[PDB]
Design a protein around this ligand. Structure first.
Ligand code: K
Ligand code: MG
Ligand code: MG
Ligand code: MG
Ligand code: MG
Ligand code: ZN
Lengths: 142, 102, 136, 74, 55, 131
RNA sequence: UGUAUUCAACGAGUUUAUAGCCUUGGCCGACAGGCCCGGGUAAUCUUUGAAAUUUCAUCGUGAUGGGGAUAGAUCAUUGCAA
């Protein structure tokens, strides 16, 4: 088993993201935006993938299983508190957004804040800190 | 008509507290009573560290103020009347005497 | 030969294996999703972490018979990193400890101490002693 | 500088090279195997375990932060 | 002022709810052991209170 | 009928349902901070402010915006009932004018009346450097 | 990083009102937290009271499982108000 199989893949694609084949599956999946070590770990656990294998060792069907697990956390008993999009503003649904969907959600939040002239939105627009930090001495880049 | 009378003595002066304890012990002994103690509890050291300056100028220098409280415990096996008579002896200022049962 | 005469690590491994083989433990559904404490960054690496924790807790109760959930939270706590701020002690998960204590009680390994906490039963003493004896 | 392109899984040539020469090394450690066979530390540890299973090497001393291994026979 | 307005702001906590028992200043109050004295007043009255400097 | 490209919704609830929804059910859709604020109970001043806003809306001529209701309550939380109201919010110096929109519910009135003037930097003065 | 393992000292703690301070124990909860019996005005109860470290695994020279700045969503506690 120590010898690489002929099917070993050095580079694989998932949601238009390059995934390193040499990295372990748990930490290889983290290259996708919106997926971290905790979420990747639980997704691998729920998909029955063996955590000791590399990203390139597995088969494509296992990547599809991982993606369905990620896209339907509720179906696999992943709790609501474990998701990065809880109680959505418009739909009010709980889901794990990833890749360009995460950027779309972030842009929607920022533009919604800016449209109503909310203070946080104005701070975002001006390029200043939004979480109350002092700005006299730190955060100097331009 | 025999009870374990508990006597607690607290003071800031070691000499007066020790003298009062010795006087109580000798008084109890003179009556052929059984005396257990005096037991010296760990000294309580109240500590306050405050800046010397009444303002913010100069080297930050600090005063270490301590107030030491010494506590003693004495147990007597006798009736209430005899212990009350014994404790009636003169007690110098700064020594607090409390008498209880068990 | 008793538990005190064997290495704690080897005894913990042996007793975790024994507990798993027993089949009386009822692991909660969240064992594979929760961390062991707020101070942790990732879930336990070992898939058998629940049985190992139960064995360690049983050994602790065997050595001392007055521990409660808070005591076990302190025992399995540790430093918590705070990014750019210094580290401070942090307690571990209390739900895991409560569930493990209840499961161990269900197996007659420990019971409720009259003074509070949990105490090792005679059956628990016998089981741990036999496991330690078989380690050699 | 140039990054080291260590392999996480053996190829047949490197696996045969391991099985041939590794049992003849005076000192065997995961770092030594990683530097010689040009393999990752994890693959080096797995290869050391495999060689120990085969009986071609022996354990001089085992520690979590340091594993020292040597040829079974001179 | 009007009863419901004059001095109506709650003062159940914070520096504004405590003052030095000696001078009434609200700053640098020593609350340890119930002294409730400002640091200056406490440093002035320490010897009378019974606090001694040993080191 | 009218066709709206982006119909307003809050947690999957349309605008019309929000108005008819009671406070108990409406709070569950709000985030943690407004939920805690409502559970603790609003004081007399917010109730008076909502009553005044109601009165201003009632007296508004049809097809016209309500009059200005000015208040110092910068910590008031916007509820769906206040949508469409015209409120003057004190910032410590002046009552800033805003109109309540559906997207501003569950926010504080302070968030729409900036208390400071944004900084525009002039040339550094004497003593800025050589420290 | 994840387990297993186990060695301090200086100190501080209540108006008892259903209860105010330090809080054990039990129950609920992933956590944050919540509820219920209670102890302590104290060498009496919290206090059976730390981490670095030790130990075994994963990681493998890759700004990488180093680093945690910045930011989004959401949940609790303090407080009249976050
Ligand atoms: K700045
Ligand atoms: Mg990622
Ligand atoms: Mg200890
Ligand atoms: Mg990194
Ligand atoms: Mg890190
Ligand atoms: Zn004063």
């Amino acid at each position: 088993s120590l010898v690489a199989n002929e099917e070993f893949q050095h580079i694989l694609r998932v949601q238009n993201t390059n995934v390193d084949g040499k990295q372990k599956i748990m930490f290889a999946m983290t290259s996708i935006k919106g997926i971290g070590r905790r979420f990747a770990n639980i997704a691998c656990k729920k998909a029955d993938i063996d955590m000791n294998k590399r990203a390139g060792e597995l088969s494509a069907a296992e990547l599809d299983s991982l993606m369905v697990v990620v896209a339907n956390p509720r179906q696999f008993k992943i709790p609501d508190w474990f998701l990065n999009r809880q109680k959505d503003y418009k739909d009010g649904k709980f889901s794990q957004v990833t890749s360009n969907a995460l950027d779309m959600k972030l842009r929607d939040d920022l533009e919604r804040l800016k449209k109503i002239r909310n203070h946080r939105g104005l701070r975002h627009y001006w390029g200043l800190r939004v979480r109350g930090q002092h700005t006299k001495t730190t955060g100097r880049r331009g | 008509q025999i009870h374990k009378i508990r006597i607690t003595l607290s003071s800031k002066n070691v000499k007066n507290l020790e003298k009062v304890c010795a006087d109580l012990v000798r008084g109890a002994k003179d009556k052929r009573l059984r005396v257990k103690g005096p037991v010296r509890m760990p000294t309580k050291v109240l500590n306050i560290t405050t800046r010397k300056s009444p303002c913010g100028e100069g080297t930050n220098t600090w005063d270490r103020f301590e107030l030491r409280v010494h506590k003693r415990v004495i147990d007597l096996f006798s009736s209430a009347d005899v212990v009350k008579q014994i404790t009636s002896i003169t007690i110098e200022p700064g020594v607090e005497v409390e008498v209880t049962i068990a | 030969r008793t538990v005190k005469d064997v290495s704690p690590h080897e005894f913990v491994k042996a007793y975790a294996a024994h507990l798993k083989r027993s089949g009386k433990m009822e692991l909660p559904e969240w064992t594979d999703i929760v961390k062991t404490g707020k101070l942790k960054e990732l879930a336990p690496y070992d898939p058998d972490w629940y049985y190992i924790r139960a064995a360690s807790m049983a050994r602790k109760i065997y050595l001392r018979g007055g521990l409660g959930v808070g005591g076990f939270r302190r025992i399995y706590g540790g430093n918590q990193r705070n990014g750019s701020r210094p580290r401070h002690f942090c307690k571990s998960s209390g739900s895991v400890a409560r569930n493990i204590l209840q499961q161990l009680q269900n197996m007659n390994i420990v019971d409720f101490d009259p003074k509070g906490g949990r105490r090792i039963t005679s059956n628990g003493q016998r089981d741990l002693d036999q496991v330690a004896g078989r380690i050699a | 500088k140039e990054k080291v392109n260590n392999m996480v899984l053996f190829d047949k040539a490197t696996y045969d090279k391991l099985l041939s020469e590794a049992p003849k090394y005076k000192l065997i450690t995961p770092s030594v195997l990683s530097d010689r066979l040009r393999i990752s530390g994890s693959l080096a540890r797995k290869a050391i375990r495999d060689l120990m299973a085969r009986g071609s090497i022996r354990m001089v001393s085992a520690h979590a932060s340091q594993q020292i291994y040597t040829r079974a026979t001179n | 002022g009007h009863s419901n307005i004059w001095n109506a702001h709650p003062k159940n906590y914070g520096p504004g709810s405590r003052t030095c028992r000696v001078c009434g200043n609200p700053h640098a109050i020593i609350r340890k052991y119930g002294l409730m004295c400002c640091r200056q007043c406490f440093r002035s009255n320490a010897k009378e209170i019974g606090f001694i400097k040993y080191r | 009928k009218k066709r709206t490209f982006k119909k307003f919704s809050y947690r999957g609830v349309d605008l019309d349902a929000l108005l008819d929804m009671s406070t108990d059910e409406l709070v569950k859709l709000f985030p943690a901070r407004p939920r805690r604020r409502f559970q603790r109970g609003l004081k007399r001043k917010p109730m008076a402010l909502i009553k005044k806003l109601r009165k201003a809306k009632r007296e508004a001529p049809p097809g016209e915006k309500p009059e200005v209701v000015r208040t110092h309550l910068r910590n008031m939380i916007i509820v769906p009932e206040m949508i469409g109201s015209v409120i003057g919010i004190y910032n410590g110096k002046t009552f800033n004018q805003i109109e309540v929109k559906p997207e501003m519910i569950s926010h504080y009135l302070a968030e729409f009346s900036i208390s400071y003037k944004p900084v525009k930097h002039g040339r550094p003065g004497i003593g800025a450097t050589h420290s």
